[PDB]
Write a protein that binds this ligand. Structure first.
Ligand SMILES: Nc1ncnc2c1ncn2[C@@H]1O[C@H](COP(=O)(O)OP(=O)(O)O)[C@@H](O)[C@H]1O
Ligand SMILES: Nc1ncnc2c1ncn2[C@@H]1O[C@H](COP(=O)(O)OP(=O)(O)O)[C@@H](O)[C@H]1O
Ligand SMILES: Nc1ncnc2c1ncn2[C@@H]1O[C@H](COP(=O)(O)OP(=O)(O)O)[C@@H](O)[C@H]1O
Ligand SMILES: [Mg+2]
Ligand SMILES: [Mg+2]
Ligand SMILES: [Mg+2]
Lengths: 370, 156, 370, 370, 156
């Protein structure tokens, strides 16, 4: 059996090829103790990873090894991978092929060092690096469609027609969760709540995951919040305090469609998806307008599919039939596709083996993976 | 009047200013918004030339891109009762706007201007040209008293 | 039964001798993928032939193995013929004599190679290469008349009288449907429409076939188009975009009568037909004037027959009766004539048998076939 | 005296006929503020043009009115022309004839609207729209040759012999400096330099102008870059950060000769030039082969002339003499030719006059201009 | 062996796949590249018929169109030591290739195939037919040492 896909900026998703869901998710977090040490027994470890780092977040300084799809701390990433193989999957990596993921248009050193650690520090018999958008299509079961994958660090579009990707039409915005979260905590200050870095950021992330949603009509929704209290909702902080959030719970995800809210000049995800189309061949656009596949956690906002349906119906010819595919398992679509891909008998030839790596070095990953 | 007039889809999206800029101290909401409408009304080249030439003259008069002409038209509209031809011309343009294939997006952009840049700040006393343009985009005319602003003081 | 394969520059019309219409009519194109990857089990098939290539047109680079009635890519032509026999007709070529066509004044290596392939690659028991113009006369049922055959690659006219061809009076112009298609996409840029890919060239071909027509008087039509919008027609592209064309509707077919539009020094089809008649014996010119028979897709433009009637009448002496015969089955006249010829009992001795090829080699075609 | 304004997709080259170089050369951009100001007396200007926009680009959204040689924002193009006449040349346009330029195979409405704006908005006494490739030949001083004009938006070939253009042989390719700039942005993400946003497209354009070059042999250059690291060069951003660029230096210009890497189906500029020559009469090809004139900024890459000479020599028969003419001033050759043409005594009857315009309308441009 | 054999120049360019497709996960580098060489070796019609028929048999056997025949030849060349006739045919074809008037361009295409599609990934273990064709285009045989690659990581 083969260990399977994850490189998530916000969450890890580990498991076994052929399973229907990851066996362990836990956040991609490494926390270091601060302002403690007096008691002989109140923590002996110098770092906590994923789960049980969220539990101890109060006394820790949490930081993500992966920022906008790019891993920026390889000492901590190795800790997370070590935690994944030994403390979550309870397996020995040196006897399981491991399939990893990566956002498109990432720095190539990212893949090169990913394959170096896998083959050297973990001695995996074989590995592979896949593109998250491609895997989402595997999970959906399609061979045609444009997949809008947005997780915690990157939102990107990969149009695929008949298993053929159009690399010139790949779009990538460094605007996903962890930017909506940062905007939400900024937007909560005007309501009277501070939520200073690290530990409180996770609280803000939880309130975003629970209360935030995408308004079908932002201007109409804004008027409703101003003129009434029906949209107000309350959330209980871990210490028992209750915060009331009103229009802030649909302005936070609105930055996906109006990135200028957070000072970004790029267009919204609806226009980026439409821009990804119209860079493909004209004969392919009809099938791409349908099969608009959503994936990733950041696409889990209620009403995001309907808003994207509405937004892409605009910008496009009236005769085109826009269809947004948002399966309930969006959040694990990438992992499910990786499980499907890694389990195919025909895929077993595509593995990069330890034999190839030592012959060609880390660069092999470029001429063996998309 | 303008039979077969056609417009380029999404031609006006680039003209919409950033939301942050709409909050600028010296932002000119009226001229910037009318710039969006002027771009939105730029006839598609598919339109027959005689119709294209006629309409371009109409929107040139009512939506000139020149500042001095826009100011002069605004002052000339303070006594719209004294310019029957101007009143009819604006009605004809207003008819074109309300039939625009993307009137919904233009109305959405107009409301964003109202909330962010205070386009409808004067409410009922809004200029004749701007008010009629908004009327075409928003038929009911509720924009005259529609900018509901949330208040943070003394709220539950 | 005998197979009749009219392998034209643009379309392959194939079927069984004795039938009234070809069984298989598909484009004469081979399309190969030009994009990347990226899904396991979705890119094993290299090259697509015929309608499959046209359907997957958006991801392929389409190429015609036949250009100007001359086979230029023999590997692709072998694929086209294999597709015809095994996938479209579902026949074993070794059991059926095959009658195929070609334009007059073609390179002799073209006939030699196609004879070589049919006997050595497909093991056809016998084969024959006929002139397309002659077959059109068979389809019309006449034995006298000057045929004007214009397909995708080459336009030619062969004057025949009482069953006798006047080979010194054959005419050939490398100006046909494909040249008109290329001109249409060139003058479509005048309206801001850009079609540059081989995939988009097919769309321009569809636009031509659907909207283009021949003006009875070009100058008056140009004035009418300039003065009013009555001649404008709209066409919906595959992705929902709508394009409208005015005088381009009849300017593209006008290249047939004014080859200088595309930089050619040749004379129009009307004047070439008259020149061919003028090269014939004076005693048969009257019969030829009354039996101008049109064939091929390029003669399917509305108003082409009336324009040719007008143009030749202005060249011929006023006392002659110019008659243009344009049957509705023009597009399949060549195949219909081949089917008639192949099923004639008196024709069964004119086949090139496998035994004849063995003794004489590919050069046998020049002796047994006109 | 007459004004010569080479609008161009990227730069405005403006000046007076008879001068050896343009007076004003500034970017063809219009910048709108993105941020909130926010002081009293600052930022009352709603837009900035040319060099001022470039200087303030940090807080501006830069937009090019001309895309692929086609004006797409006429209100902004009016701003640029107003800036050119009043702020750069400091002339009253009502006194000076204005010679304009555009690429061949442009939409007719583009030059129709150019005439309308010039005669009505600016009230020029007369004007003329010249084809950019033709002017480049004027600057070179030749009467024969095939011009390869490659600016920021359009790359087009125009074969001219003894002063006669062969319009059917004119090739246009929508792949020029701006497309190379976008590709350089894309491949710069392979390293950690993620401009990946519309803010810094000008910085990477400067990188392209400073460091990029055409490899005489792409494979050898790729091997050298992979092996030695002697081709690495460093560039300092306005922030003071230093980016190192290796094989991207010659991979970006390689898109000209391999329109792939950006998903284009067309052939390289070398093959487009050869195809243009082969579409001409066989009797002028020898003179065209020896008079390959290169013009425009996109031809300023070091080694492009040598690469073009090698590539065309490989396509043309060995006995032919291939000669690439690459003047040092080929970046301003179009404007220089316009200056020469505008100052000819024989040209003074070719102007489109105000009296002619209002008598005939914008359609007059089609009659009097090539 | 083949005197007066001529080839139509630039006939093979249309057969070269796009670099984007060379990266396809199911791209057949050997068959596609051999298709380019087969097309490039197609005798020009100006060649005398006796030479054309003689040479066409040589390339048809060594560079067949059919995948079944191409695969059968590949297996039969794995033990080429027991097939002297193929040794002579492959040697004869390689002699023709090295004298091809456009060998330089075919060498560039071969290097592009190796660079992008991994044509020579097996290095010294390349099959007999493909190795001989490359040796004809690249005389020195340096291609056996695979293409140099960037190795982005640990860059200075
Ligand atoms: N129900 C939800 N509503 C809104 N946002 C969510 C929801 N669930 C998860 N998210 C967001 O999605 C992100 C996780 O997405 P994921 O696909 O796991 O990214 P990655 O692949 O980088 O781990 C988190 O940052 C979280 O804020
Ligand atoms: N209805 C039509 N109107 C105009 N042109 C047509 C029509 N039908 C087919 N054509 C043109 O005729 C050509 C096909 O004619 P055909 O007789 O099949 O030629 P070939 O024998 O070379 O295949 C195509 O290039 C197409 O553009
Ligand atoms: N020295 C140079 N090296 C490489 N590219 C250059 C150089 N100078 C200018 N360019 C490119 O040429 C383009 C401008 O060329 P130009 O002839 O001015 O085009 P246009 O006429 O459309 O303005 C720019 O996009 C720029 O990137
Ligand atoms: Mg994810
Ligand atoms: Mg035909
Ligand atoms: Mg230029």
């Amino acid at each position: 059996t083969a260990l399977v896909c994850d490189n998530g900026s916000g969450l890890v998703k580990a498991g076994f090829a052929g399973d229907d869901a990851p066996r362990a998710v836990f956040p991609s977090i490494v926390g270091r103790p601060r302002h403690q040490g007096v008691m002989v027994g109140m923590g002996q470890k110098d770092s906590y990873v994923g789960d049980e780092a969220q539990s101890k977040r109060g006394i820790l300084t949490l930081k993500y090894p992966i920022e906008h799809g790019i891993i920026t701390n390889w000492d901590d990433m190795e800790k997370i991978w070590h935690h994944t193989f030994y403390n979550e999957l309870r397996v020995a990596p040196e006897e399981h092929p491991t399939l990893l993921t990566e956002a498109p248009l990432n720095p190539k050193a990212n893949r090169e060092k990913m394959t170096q650690i896998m083959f050297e520090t973990f001695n995996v018999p074989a590995m592979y690096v896949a593109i998250q958008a491609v895997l989402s299509l595997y999970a959906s079961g399609r061979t045609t469609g444009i997949v809008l994958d947005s997780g915690d660090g990157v939102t990107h579009n990969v149009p695929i027609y008949e298993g053929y990707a159009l690399p010139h039409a790949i779009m990538r915005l460094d605007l996903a969760g962890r930017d909506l979260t940062d905007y939400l905590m900024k937007i909560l200050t005007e309501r009277g709540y501070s939520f200073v870095t690290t530990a409180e950021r996770e609280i803000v992330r939880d309130i975003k995951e629970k209360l935030c949603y995408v308004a079908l009509d932002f201007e109409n929704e804004m008027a409703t919040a101003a003129s009434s209290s029906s949209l107000e909702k309350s959330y209980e902080l871990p210490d028992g305090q209750v915060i009331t959030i009103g229009n802030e719970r649909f302005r936070c995800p609105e930055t996906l469609f109006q990135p200028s809210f957070i000072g970004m000049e790029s267009a919204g995800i609806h226009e980026t998806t439409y821009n990804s189309i119209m860079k493909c061949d004209i004969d392919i656009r009809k099938d791409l307008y349908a099969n608009n596949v959503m994936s990733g956690g950041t696409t889990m906002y209620p009403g995001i599919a309907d808003r994207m349906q509405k937004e892409i119906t605009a910008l496009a010819p009236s005769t085109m039939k826009i269809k947004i595919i948002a399966p309930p398992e969006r959040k694990y679509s990438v992992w499910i596709g990786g499980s499907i891909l890694a389990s195919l008998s025909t895929f077993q030839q595509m593995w990069i083996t330890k034999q190839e790596y030592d012959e060609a070095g880390p660069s092999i990953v470029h001429r063996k993976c998309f | 009047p303008f039979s077969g007039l056609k417009f380029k889809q999404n031609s006006f999206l680039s003209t919409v200013p950033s939301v942050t800029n709409m909050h600028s101290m010296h932002f000119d909401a009226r001229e910037t918004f009318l710039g969006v409408i002027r771009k939105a009304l730029e006839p598609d080249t598919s339109t027959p030339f005689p119709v294209r030439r006629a309409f371009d003259g109409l929107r040139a008069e009512i939506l000139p891109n020149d500042t001095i002409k826009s100011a002069a038209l605004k002052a000339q509209c303070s006594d719209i009762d004294k310019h029957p031809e101007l009143k009819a011309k604006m009605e004809t343009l207003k008819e074109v706007i309300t039939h625009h294939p993307q009137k919904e997006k233009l109305a959405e952009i107009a409301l964003q201007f109202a909330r962010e840049a205070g386009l409808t700040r004067l409410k009922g006393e809004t200029d004749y040209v701007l008010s009629n343009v908004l009327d075409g985009l928003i038929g009911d005319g509720s924009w005259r008293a529609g900018p509901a602003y949330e208040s943070y003081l003394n709220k539950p």
